[PDB]
Amino acid sequence: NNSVPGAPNRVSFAKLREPLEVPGLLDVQTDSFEWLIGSPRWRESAAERGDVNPVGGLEEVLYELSPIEDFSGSMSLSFSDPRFDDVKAPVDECKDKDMTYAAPLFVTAEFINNNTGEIKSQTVFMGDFPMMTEKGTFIINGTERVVVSQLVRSPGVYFDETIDKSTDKTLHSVKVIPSRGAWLEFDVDKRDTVGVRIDRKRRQPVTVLLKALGWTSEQIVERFGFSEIMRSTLEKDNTVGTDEALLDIYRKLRPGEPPTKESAQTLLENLFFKEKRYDLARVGRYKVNKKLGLHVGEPITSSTLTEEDVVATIEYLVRLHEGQTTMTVPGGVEVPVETDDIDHFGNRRLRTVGELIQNQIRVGMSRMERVVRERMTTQDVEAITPQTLINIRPVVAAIKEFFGTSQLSQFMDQNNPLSGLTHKRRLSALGPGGLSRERAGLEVRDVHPSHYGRMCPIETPEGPNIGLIGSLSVYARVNPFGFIETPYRKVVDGVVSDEIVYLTADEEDRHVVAQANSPIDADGRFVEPRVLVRRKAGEVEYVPSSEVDYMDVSPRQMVSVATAMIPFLEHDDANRALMGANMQRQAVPLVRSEAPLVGTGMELRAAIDAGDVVVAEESGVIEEVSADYITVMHDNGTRRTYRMRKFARSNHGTCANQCPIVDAGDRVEAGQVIADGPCTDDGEMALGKNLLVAIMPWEGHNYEDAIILSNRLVEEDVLTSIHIEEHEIDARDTKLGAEEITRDIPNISDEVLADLDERGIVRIGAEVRDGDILVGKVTPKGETELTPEERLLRAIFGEKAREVRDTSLKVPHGESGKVIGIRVFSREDEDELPAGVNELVRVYVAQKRKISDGDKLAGRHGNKGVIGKILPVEDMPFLADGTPVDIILNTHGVPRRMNIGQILETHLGWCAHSGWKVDAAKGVPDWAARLPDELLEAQPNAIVSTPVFDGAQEAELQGLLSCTLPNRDGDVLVDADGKAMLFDGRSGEPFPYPVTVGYMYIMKLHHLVDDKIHARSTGPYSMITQQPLGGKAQFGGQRFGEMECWAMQAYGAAYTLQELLTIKSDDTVGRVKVYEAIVKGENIPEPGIPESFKVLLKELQSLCLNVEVLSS
Amino acid sequence: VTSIRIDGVLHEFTTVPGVKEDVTEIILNLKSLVVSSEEDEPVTMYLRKQ
Amino acid sequence: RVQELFEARVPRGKAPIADVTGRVRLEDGERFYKITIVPDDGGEEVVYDKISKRQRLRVFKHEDGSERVLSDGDHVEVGQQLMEGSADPHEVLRVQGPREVQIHLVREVQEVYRAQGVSIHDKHIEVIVRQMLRRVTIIDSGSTEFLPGSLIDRAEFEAENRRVVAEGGEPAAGRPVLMGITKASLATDSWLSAAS
Amino acid sequence: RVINRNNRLKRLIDLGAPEIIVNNEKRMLQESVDALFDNGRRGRPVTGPGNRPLKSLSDLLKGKQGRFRQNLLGKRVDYSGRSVIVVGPQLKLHQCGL
Amino acid sequence: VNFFDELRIGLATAEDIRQWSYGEVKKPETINYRTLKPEKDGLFCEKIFGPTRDWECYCGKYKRVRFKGIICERCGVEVTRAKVRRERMGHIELAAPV
Ligand SMILES: [Zn+2]
């Protein structure tokens, strides 16, 4: 059932079949942009989904704006039908040439003059648009960008309920939150004053505004006769009269203004019926209509609040106060009456990139149309043209600044394809337009019974942003409004239905959802009469096998993409599983990757959709292949070529390459991988290698999470990685002159510049050591001069007649390696450069790092560690057949952390590596009844896969471990339990007891040791603070916190603190004298007065406060 | 083997037209080569295939 | 809890206290407990109008058992809490002096720390409480320059009082009082640290 | 501002003028010195950019960036170094590996 | 050298400020916007605080290193390291008490 053509074959412990393949993992990201721009494919998809009105994003935003007009009504403008054009240049050049992948858009604007009756219509240019590539990313200025979705509370009506501590009576509060406008709060209180708070005003009785509209008092009485408390309020109000009511409302809203009937009458419609001032999203209107069951039969077109909505809301509130279960309104079907919850996914919508870009372009359009309307009103009416009206600067500036500074525009982390995919699938909850860290409640960070199937509960950042950053589920798809959905198959009469439907939160709550793992007969008959089920909220209980309505699709319907590829996830702990999931997103691409021996079946699919692996479009036959490019011949006679980037610096400093895995003369079918990117092996993810592990404390070198590695890994490049640095220098013009890169440099020996070429740059392929010169340049000197008279003089004379300083770029502190390539941009060659620059050159330095001491390693079960020591290959313990182990793990950390899953993973890995053959001559053993018939016979170095929540059981492992194929020597190493006899490498005698061994997948984290190690004895000093610089790159000293001062005081150590505060941080003469004394044999002179104290003095003397010293 | 010399190539992080794998892969493959030395001085070999 | 204890604010529990030793004459109000104690030597009854939502604590008897209920008509020792909670340090200080409040604070902090299982020596807490309660509020200045109601350390107040008395000037009437860490640290002798 | 206003005062008194303008200008000068020794102490603080209050002379002492506090947060020292730590069982108690 | 028995804060006086400073600023002009040099007696003039560079007279008459604490008559400046610029002050003169 391998959907892709030529994926590697790896039989799986399959017991249940999923009736649908995993949907396009990046479809969610691309669909928003496709809807926004508007394409035939999106229109066809929308028509298939059944939506009556196919409406794009640009068309909608710039159609709801038009027709603009002047207040006099003698002029108007309209413009619709936005359309796009082709690309400027391919993505490769745009990324390499520093350009921006974009495309122009043209809008056909029609210019109509009312009083005359003329039409002026022609195309208009409206800037460029940052188009989205096929991998769901934005290329801005050559740097990758990815926008993350956001979680917002859908605009609507929420019925809150707070219990009084003294009265102990229910107070039902209803609050409406539209997209923009006034907020209405109707709350029944102990005093019974059912009032309103329009724009955080005083609680004015609802009846006052109800009558302000002219609502007849008799209609109030009859429609509220069933209500008793509200009837009491009606009998309690004093002011009566439409004019009096509206004037009182106006005074409460705007006091101190001429109270007139017309003013209040116009303000009512302006604040509640003027669409521009008061607007709600179509999602909000639809949700409110569904909540009240009013206006359900028609497609929402008007997006303004209506009076019937308000009267229905107050009726609902009073009925809820009465304690009724369900309420009905004329024209509305029966619906339940209950309070709403903020943390329910039936209210929290999802705004994709489409919504954000639409809002930004809406702001830009508003800014443009304001000036356009002002210009048309003020400009001459005769020879005015739309070309002269439309201004393109505001919209382009808005989009540019949104892409640049908006917090929702983050660099796409590209340590490995999995990290990029996770970032593209991320669900942010903070940032602009959202709650802050301090104001956000702690409860929102907890799980909700409605999260099942929509947001993974495991994957989450470890830092303080816990619970605010989730991830889509495997099968989750966003509905066209923004409410996440989840597939389900509906049971009609106790028989499973192959056909599936998608349900949202509200509909899911209103139905009965079965359990996927519940046994089901092949004919669709429920073998068990009682099947567990999930209910409204936090309720699970067995029910007859008939009333059940819905059933899930797969057991893996609630896990994230990252968490979906952690074997034996049903045995670890929540914290450990989360830690492992977070660790999986920090691997480092190695040089020679190997696919895992044990891993879920969602590896190849997660790699094909990652975009970092090329794939043929049409089934053709390869003519020839090369390390740099490939040429495939289509069956239609069209030759096509694919170019593969080799050794290009990744967005996070790692390397990226592609190696074709195809041979010359093979008819490659469409959809078959052709090249493997970083962290890949035959078109499937591979973030690490396979090492033979042993679990036993060894001389305390593996004490407290430490790790020991055999030198075989070091000397075989098993865990060798490649890291590429990047440096750049620029020569920008100055008032004193222009700097130029030149090979020559004042007062430098020939040896120092022996590497620079004629043009003034280091030759490619030349080794560079720390402190070496990387590119030379000369900085002119400052000499006062005449602007125009000496400018004439210097043009004709005085050439190179003043001085030049040296400011050449040098390798920072702690870098080395080869020089792989040099990129130079020149303004002469007509290359776009930032303003005020002439020559910007960047140099790439690539260094090969071998795993060493102080390096982090961690498996897929979240068990970090450090390389305590790398013993020689001749010292590690070895099996009875002479096979030395490669790594030793401690045992005390397994049961306390409670991550027993890794033990099972190691056992299964050993079983798969050694190969097994289960006896079947006498028949299938009872423990092997459910094993797939093709999984009973394996080969050495076989591949196995255990899907999450459905894998080999304990009995399966027990049986398999008892039938492993013997070694070529004829003997079996491990026992049935899985332990084995070792031999000490030092003593040479066997250990008294057996130990566990096996192959476990090991990754490599990004927290290397070379970055951390740093020293500083004497170096550059800051000029403004007189303190040493900071940071490893700047070669600066370490910080000295105040807690250290407290500790030093605690010991009573005085002279040490004096030195630390005076003689090594501030005192200039002190530093010079102590350095000279150390250079010689003289004793260190006592420190002096720190610069801080003298600065404090000379500063406090500036406030007329005579600060004496009183040395006496 | 101690050190190699590839004509027309200046360093190891690159490729060479006509081959299917880059310089790093061929270095890794050559690491498996096994040779026995009778002389106690650096000797030189050649590998010409077109 | 430790923060509140050291800060010496109004206890949240605010348990009733035995201001005087006498024969407890308590009438149990189901809404608000009313507590009165007849003095043994003589005098009036101190009246407490406490909230009745709690469950009365042990009465001080020869057995001295926690299971016992607060029995009316018994006798209690001065300063004892009548019900569970925490006694305001100011009240116990004014009615007992500094030693009792010092030992009570030390015992309370030690108890809360041992609740978690950690152990620390008492002297580390004595060194702190010694500084915390080293202020003598003054009600009247009389023959003294300092403003009445101004905090003065005990040593300097005593020195000035003895100096003024030795010359015949009337003494200044002042009493000891404690404060929280913030107020105890905000008032110092060196101006530079205060500015810091 | 202060120097400019003082020079305006000097020039005006040299030129000669009635009492009102002297005083009006003097009141102005008094405000500038008060502002310089402290901005926002009393009245509307002066704001040039983005309606942002300016950092007066007295602001060098109060606040988190006040020079008093910053002398206690610590300084960057020389002869330092940081690195990862790995347990070593081959060392005596009064020993360490560098 | 480093003996500070006590520290007392006294309230200064006009004569005290006269004593402390070494100049009397007169113009608000900052560093020149063209030649990037202080203006005559401006807010940075070397005649007040000290030389912009170390051991460098304004006019170049005493620009040799062999001049410590020496005043140039041509430009009326002193010759000492740039650090001295950090420890000398200026006092403005007021035409009206404040
Ligand atoms: Zn001079």
UniProtKB/Swiss-Prot annotation, chain A:
Effect recorded for K120A: Does not affect association with TRCF, but weakens interaction with CarD
PROSITE patterns: RNA_POL_BETA (PS01166)
Outcome, altering S121A: Does not affect association with TRCF, but weakens interaction with CarD
Reactions this protein catalyses: RNA(n) + a ribonucleoside 5'-triphosphate = RNA(n+1) + diphosphate
Consequence when changing L430P: In strain: vr12 and SP22; rifampicin-resistant
Record note on what altering H423P does: In strain: vr8; rifampicin-resistant
GO cellular component: cytosol; DNA-directed RNA polymerase complex; peptidoglycan-based cell wall; plasma membrane
GO MF annotations in UniProt: DNA binding; DNA-directed RNA polymerase activity; ribonucleoside binding
Pfam families: RNA_pol_Rpb2_1 (PF04563), RNA_pol_Rpb2_2 (PF04561), RNA_pol_Rpb2_3 (PF04565), RNA_pol_Rpb2_45 (PF10385), RNA_pol_Rpb2_6 (PF00562), RNA_pol_Rpb2_7 (PF04560)
Effect of H423L: In strain: SP28; rifampicin-resistant
EC number(s) stated in the UniProt entry for this protein: 2.7.7.6
GO annotation terms (biological process): DNA-templated transcription; response to antibiotic
UniProt keyword list: Antibiotic resistance, DNA-directed RNA polymerase, Nucleotidyltransferase, Transcription, Transferase
Function recorded in the entry: DNA-dependent RNA polymerase catalyzes the transcription of DNA into RNA using the four ribonucleoside triphosphates as substrates.
Subunit structure: The RNAP catalytic core consists of 2 alpha, 1 beta, 1 beta' and 1 omega subunit. When a sigma factor is associated with the core the holoenzyme is formed, which can initiate transcription. Interacts with CarD, TRCF (Mfd) and RbpA.
Family designation: Belongs to the RNA polymerase beta chain family.
Protein's name in the database: DNA-directed RNA polymerase subunit beta
UniProtKB/Swiss-Prot annotation, chain B:
Stated induction or repression of this protein's expression: 3-fold repressed by starvation.
Highest taxon listed in the record's lineage: Bacteria
Family per record: Belongs to the RNA polymerase alpha chain family.
The protein's role, per its UniProt record: DNA-dependent RNA polymerase catalyzes the transcription of DNA into RNA using the four ribonucleoside triphosphates as substrates.
Entry's free-text remark on domains: The N-terminal domain is essential for RNAP assembly and basal transcription, whereas the C-terminal domain is involved in interaction with transcriptional regulators and with upstream promoter elements.
Self-association state and partner proteins as the record states: Homodimer. The RNAP catalytic core consists of 2 alpha, 1 beta, 1 beta' and 1 omega subunit. When a sigma factor is associated with the core the holoenzyme is formed, which can initiate transcription.
Record's protein name: DNA-directed RNA polymerase subunit alpha
Species name: Mycobacterium tuberculosis (strain ATCC 25618 / H37Rv)
Gene that produces this protein: rpoA
From Swiss-Prot, chain C:
Induction details: 6-fold repressed by starvation.
Role summary: DNA-dependent RNA polymerase catalyzes the transcription of DNA into RNA using the four ribonucleoside triphosphates as substrates.
Family: Belongs to the RNA polymerase beta' chain family.
Subunit structure: The RNAP catalytic core consists of 2 alpha, 1 beta, 1 beta' and 1 omega subunit. When a sigma factor is associated with the core the holoenzyme is formed, which can initiate transcription.
Name recorded for this polypeptide: DNA-directed RNA polymerase subunit beta'
Lineage per the UniProt record: Bacteria, Bacillati, Actinomycetota, Actinomycetes, Mycobacteriales
Gene, per the UniProt record: rpoC
